[PDB]
Structure 1
Amino acid sequence: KPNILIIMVDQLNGKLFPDGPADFLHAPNLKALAKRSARFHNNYTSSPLAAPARASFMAGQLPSRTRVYDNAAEYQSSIPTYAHHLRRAGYYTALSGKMHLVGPDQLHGFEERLTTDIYPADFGWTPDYRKPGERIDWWYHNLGSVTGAGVAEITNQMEYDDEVAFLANQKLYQLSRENDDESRRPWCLTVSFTHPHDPYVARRKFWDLYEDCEHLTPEVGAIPLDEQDPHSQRIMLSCDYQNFDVTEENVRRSRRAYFANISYLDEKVGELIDTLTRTRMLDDTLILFCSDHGDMLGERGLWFKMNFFEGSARVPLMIAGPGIAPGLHLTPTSNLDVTPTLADLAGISLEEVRPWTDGVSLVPMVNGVERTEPVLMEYAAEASYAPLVAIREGKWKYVYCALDPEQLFDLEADPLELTNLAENPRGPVDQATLTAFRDMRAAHWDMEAFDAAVRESQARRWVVYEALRNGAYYPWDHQPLQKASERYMRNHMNLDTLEESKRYPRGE
């Protein structure tokens, strides 16, 4: 059974990984990794928002099934995740970094978690479908990140990711001490970074890499409010766009710092692989690179996520290691597919995970078997007044919301999604295609039931959270475990035995 190192980053636009990292990015370690990887060019989040994407990623289940509709929705501890599936199959499992789990369970199957979460674990960020058009300024996104972009040597997120990286490498070193043990458990370590998520603020060393960058403005620029589709209009309102003057310089500084923070992450990818190499674990380790959702990065005038356009919904996915054929795949894939893919790679039978996952294993695709299943996405959080769903199949993307006109995009003819074929069909094929997707949509979702479930979930939490914020607060944030009385040299141990057990490799 191979080891599994999952490297995850937050808010990474998948279009920036056309075939591994784009040429213009300074990312040598991720480019070298990509050359060894199966690379999934058209990979999509299951939900363009942090907590919904991450609960779905861990479970291999859609938000409608996990019930994690938004960034404040409880994730039930009884829902199996890839950590349960691997741990049940004999893996040691650990998390360093972020997963935005909401509720008192901050492990969800992970045997050990090395850091707290950067974000809250409580019900604060609960949207309210009963009050459409409101925004909550103290947690909603706003374009202050765009006007505030720049250069700093420490930030909240760099403190977090610096520590995530250090503890991940320390854990790989600790795990190598078991390498000569016949009865060692294989390990699965998830390293989950908060970059390149905003604030768009970067260390000067990485900012300086992009002085001459040719990609600091999007090809598709700002669409005025009057000309936006309704959901995009709700996002602009939710971001308080009217109270910010986003200049071209602001767009350029934000994209520049974002690219710089990819380069910041690339250095951390190199450290992890160097640790794997020197500990002699690289040949037995699968490495997956993934992200929860994208960032529009100013394309269409939009920033951040919360929508199904390519920049928000596309996220990179790469897998490398024993038994994995390197190569590029264009068939659309989903983050929903990661958990069943990991289970398959770990030797777990299809039947053991079939009842618990909505995705499919990608391993047959890596081995030349055509994948046919469509890619499904959902969104039911801020800037929605009712749930949205999307279907990505073949060359098409279809988006449905009961409150909006449908969208239908031919991504091979129209990769920038500039012509809505549901409004302006090119011919009778486009009209027949729209009908097929409507049928597919009715097959997969009951939208009235979806809306009612989201409303009931919000209403529960508004009662409960108001109560929990009265009197003394009981926090749910993960506190990594204290072990000082059992670490290093203590006088209930054999002193020379200790040094030998903590040294690795041995006898050289």
Structure 2
Amino acid sequence: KRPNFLVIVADDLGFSDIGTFGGEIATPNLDALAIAGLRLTDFHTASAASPTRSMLLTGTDHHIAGIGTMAEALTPELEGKPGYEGHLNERVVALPELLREAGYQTLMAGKWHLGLKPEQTPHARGFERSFALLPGAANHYGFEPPYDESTPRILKGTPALYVEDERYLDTLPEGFYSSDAFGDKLLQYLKERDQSRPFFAYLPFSAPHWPLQAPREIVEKYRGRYDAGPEALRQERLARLKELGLVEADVEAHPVLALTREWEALEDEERAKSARAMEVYAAMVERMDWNIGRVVDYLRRQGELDNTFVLFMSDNGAEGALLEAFPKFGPDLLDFLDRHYDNSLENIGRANSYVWYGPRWAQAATAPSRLYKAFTTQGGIRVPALVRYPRLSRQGAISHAFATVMDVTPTLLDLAGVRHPGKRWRGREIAEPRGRSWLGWLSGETEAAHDENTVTGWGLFGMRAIRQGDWKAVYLPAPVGPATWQLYDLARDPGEIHDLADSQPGKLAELIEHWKRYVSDTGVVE
């Protein structure tokens, strides 16, 4: 029989957060899947949420699929540019659209971030059943601030805007907490399914994305765990990554860069609030894991899990952003939060708190990689991923084989026996995948789905990367980089520390040719 699919996406989860990826956070359900499956150390997304999601569900690049930049970042200049529509566009066909016409039941519960309008919903784009947060974020409990002209832009852009199928919801249920509600709905849809046909189940959490919020009883489990701070944590993560074989023992970690005060420079009250944010974060991840368990355990008891291809991934690097640092997110975010929320120590994590853990906590989870979410360095794009499917040969191991989010759609089509329709679908021109099916690799026929000549690009927020084999060039503009192409050998320098631009000018030049072709193939506009 054709397999089921369960595609689970964490939101801004960091590389070493989960237990089997070197973390101290309780993730038993994921860990059971991970150790019996295949853990990926060289799996890549885009550097931010909607770009990644557009790639996941198409098998092509975000600049083609409609999210050339984030909608919330769109300009009048970028306006009519193809692929910069700000929603999944009609130049692509989505994975669920293809499966659904081939007899799969398409079921989703979670964050969408691929369009706000009726014709852009999961219902519109291939899901027979869906319960979805349409924006990029929202209050986990559905506590909404006043909305008027004076509301910070980052809050105006993140209302708790939910749909079920075609119905825009006017209320949320009592006791609504995002991760629990997604677990509840997806379980509902699975229990309500036609058991005589396969399913494609999509479970995009909004945890552990800001605002950091979680049940108090889970936050309590972490009381005091993070009192030694983000650098002490980074060292624990690095040690554990090397003990587990996820990173080689000789790997040189990128230095931590931030403009904030280091832990030892903070006052006791400042530390206590920052540590509490990280305790809350941990609980978000544990609670997400618990919901995943509810879904997976149900499938297991049904006798369906072993014929379910289970993919878990984060959508981008850990979130190091200081939301107060960007005037576009304002005006006066901190003041608004001071007047509308309660970020007192004892209230952090509750519905009427609103915190984010910042650059030092984030870089603890991306280490040894350079930087974090919204950068084209490895910190922003290399994400934890696991595949559990016992029909595959490559299970029980850790793989450092190059892989991307664009490989997923072709892999699942392949397993489903469903052909990509080529260049036309429903009477319109569509893009063909840029990724490659993982089947030969995971079936043990080949060592990897890519090779030394594979070329992949990235570009978002003025930053660039271009990679061929294990050679990668990066471009970070001022004030966050040198506004010049830097060149790295990822096989020797996973931390992107040693710029080889001057010593290997021919390799850089080759990569710059690839970058131009990437721009041209995908329609990148800066």
Normalising by the residue count of structure 1, what TM-score does the alignment of the two structures yield? 0.68
For residue 359 of structure 1, the aligned residue among 435, 450, 469 is 435
Which shifted more, 48-57 or 365-374?
365-374
Partner residue, 2:33: 33
CA contact 2:108–2:132 (8 Å) conserved in 1: no
Letter in 1 for 2:182: V
For residue 273 of structure 1, the aligned residue among 270, 286, 296 is 296
**Percent identity for Structure 1 against Structure 2:** 26
Partner residue, 1:493: none
For the aligned residues, what is the CA RMSD? 3.6
Partner residue, 1:432: 506
Partner residue, 1:399: 474
Kindly state the Cα deviation for residue 402 of structure 1 after the two structures are TM-superposed: 8.2
* Structure 1 CA distance for aligned equivalents of residues 173 and 34 of structure 2: 29
**Aligned with 2:132: secondary structure?**
coil
Partner residue, 2:345: none
Partner residue, 2:178: 160
Are residues 1:441 and 2:453 paired? no
For residue 331 of structure 1, the aligned residue among 394, 401, 405 is 401
* Structure 2 CA distance for aligned equivalents of residues 204 and 192 of structure 1: 23
**Cα-to-partner distance string for 1:243-291 (whole Å, 9 max, x where unaligned):** xxx9555554433332322111111111111111222222322211122
Q: How does 1:257-336 map to 2 (within 5 A)?
A: 257-297=280-320, 298=358, 305-324=373-392, 325-326=394-395, 327-336=397-406
* Structure 2 CA distance for aligned equivalents of residues 434 and 275 of structure 1: 51
Partner residue, 1:117: 133
Q: Which runs of 5+ in 2 are unaligned?
A: 72-85, 138-150, 157-171, 236-253, 261-268, 321-357, 364-371, 424-429
**Cα-to-partner distance string for 1:198-241 (whole Å, 9 max, x where unaligned):** 1223333333343335774346665366xxxxxxxxxx9xxxxx
Kindly state the Cα deviation for residue 376 of structure 1 after the two structures are TM-superposed: 2.7
Partner residue, 1:80: 93
Q: Per the alignment, do residues 271 and 120 of structure 1 end up closer, same or farther by CA in structure 2, a change over 3 Å counting?
A: closer
**Cα-to-partner distance string for 1:281-311 (whole Å, 9 max, x where unaligned):** 2232221112221215455797862112333
Which shifted more, 206-215 or 25-34?
206-215
* Structure 1 CA distance for aligned equivalents of residues 113 and 200 of structure 2: 19
Q: How does 1:471-490 map to 2 (within 5 A)?
A: none
Q: How does 1:187-266 map to 2 (within 5 A)?
A: 187-210=199-222, 211-213=224-226, 216-217=230-231, 218=234, 223=257, 251-266=274-289
Partner residue, 1:12: 13
* Structure 1 CA distance for aligned equivalents of residues 295 and 64 of structure 2: 34
**Aligned with 1:116: secondary structure?**
strand
Kindly state the Cα deviation for residue 34 of structure 1 after the two structures are TM-superposed: 0.6
Kindly state the Cα deviation for residue 413 of structure 1 after the two structures are TM-superposed: 3.6
**Cα-to-partner distance string for 1:4-63 (whole Å, 9 max, x where unaligned):** 11112111223446x943252311111100122222211111x22222221121111112
CA contact 1:222–1:302 (8 Å) conserved in 2: no
CA contact 1:57–1:336 (8 Å) conserved in 2: yes
**Aligned with 1:262: secondary structure?**
helix
* Structure 1 CA distance for aligned equivalents of residues 129 and 230 of structure 2: 37
CA contact 1:340–1:361 (8 Å) conserved in 2: yes
Kindly state the Cα deviation for residue 417 of structure 1 after the two structures are TM-superposed: 2.9
Letter in 1 for 2:181: E
CA contact 1:56–1:62 (8 Å) conserved in 2: yes
**Cα-to-partner distance string for 1:414-458 (whole Å, 9 max, x where unaligned):** 333333333xx5xx4x3333222222222322499632xx6xxxx
Q: Which runs of 5+ in 1 are unaligned?
A: 122-135, 142-153, 226-235, 237-245, 455-508
Partner residue, 1:56: 55
Q: Per the alignment, do residues 299 and 434 of structure 1 end up closer, same or farther by CA in structure 2, a change over 3 Å counting?
A: farther
Q: How does 1:122-161 map to 2 (within 5 A)?
A: 137-139=152-154, 159-161=177-179
Kindly state the Cα deviation for residue 400 of structure 1 after the two structures are TM-superposed: 3.3
CA contact 2:111–2:136 (8 Å) conserved in 1: no
**Aligned with 2:126: secondary structure?**
coil
Letter in 2 for 1:334: T
**Cα-to-partner distance string for 1:143-187 (whole Å, 9 max, x where unaligned):** xxxxxxxxxxx9999722211110111112112xx33xxxx3211
Partner residue, 2:456: 376
* Structure 2 CA distance for aligned equivalents of residues 293 and 337 of structure 1: 16
Q: Per the alignment, do residues 75 and 362 of structure 1 end up closer, same or farther by CA in structure 2, a change over 3 Å counting?
A: same
Q: Per the alignment, do residues 449 and 98 of structure 1 end up closer, same or farther by CA in structure 2, a change over 3 Å counting?
A: closer
Kindly state the Cα deviation for residue 120 of structure 1 after the two structures are TM-superposed: 6.7
* Structure 2 CA distance for aligned equivalents of residues 350 and 379 of structure 1: 26
CA contact 1:15–1:311 (8 Å) conserved in 2: no
**Aligned with 1:223: secondary structure?**
coil
Are residues 1:170 and 2:188 paired? yes
**Aligned with 1:34: secondary structure?**
helix
* Structure 2 CA distance for aligned equivalents of residues 441 and 412 of structure 1: 20
Are residues 1:68 and 2:58 paired? no
**Aligned with 2:496: secondary structure?**
coil
Letter in 2 for 1:4: F
Kindly state the Cα deviation for residue 191 of structure 1 after the two structures are TM-superposed: 1.3
CA contact 2:455–2:468 (8 Å) conserved in 1: yes
For residue 343 of structure 1, the aligned residue among 413, 422, 427 is 413
**Aligned with 2:60: secondary structure?**
coil
Letter in 2 for 1:82: L
CA contact 1:99–1:117 (8 Å) conserved in 2: yes
Which shifted more, 370-379 or 431-440?
370-379
**Aligned with 1:391: secondary structure?**
strand
CA contact 2:63–2:69 (8 Å) conserved in 1: no
**Aligned with 1:266: secondary structure?**
helix
* Structure 2 CA distance for aligned equivalents of residues 120 and 224 of structure 1: 25
Partner residue, 1:131: none
Partner residue, 2:112: 99
* Structure 1 CA distance for aligned equivalents of residues 510 and 270 of structure 2: 42
Partner residue, 1:128: none
Are residues 1:389 and 2:464 paired? yes
Q: Per the alignment, do residues 408 and 207 of structure 1 end up closer, same or farther by CA in structure 2, a change over 3 Å counting?
A: farther
CA contact 1:331–1:394 (8 Å) conserved in 2: no
For residue 416 of structure 1, the aligned residue among 495, 506, 518 is 495
* Structure 1 CA distance for aligned equivalents of residues 274 and 376 of structure 2: 21
